[PDB]
Amino acid sequence: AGKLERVDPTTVRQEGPWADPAQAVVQTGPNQYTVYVLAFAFGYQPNPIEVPQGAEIVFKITSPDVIHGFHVEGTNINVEVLPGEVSTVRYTFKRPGEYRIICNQYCGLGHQNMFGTIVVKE
Ligand code: CUA
Numbered sequence: 001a002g003k004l005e006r007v008d009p010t011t012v013r014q015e016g017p018w019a020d021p022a023q024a025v026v027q028t029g030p031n032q033y034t035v036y037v038l039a040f041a042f043g044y045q046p047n048p049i050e051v052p053q054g055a056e057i058v059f060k061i062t063s064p065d066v067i068h069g070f071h072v073e074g075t076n077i078n079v080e081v082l083p084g085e086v087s088t089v090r091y092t093f094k095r096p097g098e099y100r101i102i103c104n105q106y107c108g109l110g111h112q113n114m115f116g117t118i119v120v121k122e
């Protein structure tokens, strides 16, 4: 369906799975990692996102401020990030390297330079 759906935008940064960025990547299965991503103006947390190749990655993305976009360059990952809502996208990276995350939802003056990075390890 699935897990995360609704969240509180006012406390997302201090209580819960997105509050501590050191803990953003959580193993949730024998070959599966959940990554709690905060899309905010203007950037992504954590940065970089580090994940192993071949593992199913479950991205859980929300915003503490306005609507953003979460698009990973070179992939079909393309989702809307709404405040108060959790966007869930599942993906298995099968090539190591650095991927760029870009915002494709105009979110204010820093929109252009709102970028993130995912490093897929070997
Ligand atoms: Cu975030 Cu545009």
Ligand SMILES: [Zn+2]
Pocket: 071, 072, 073, 074, 075
């Ligand atoms: Zn693209």
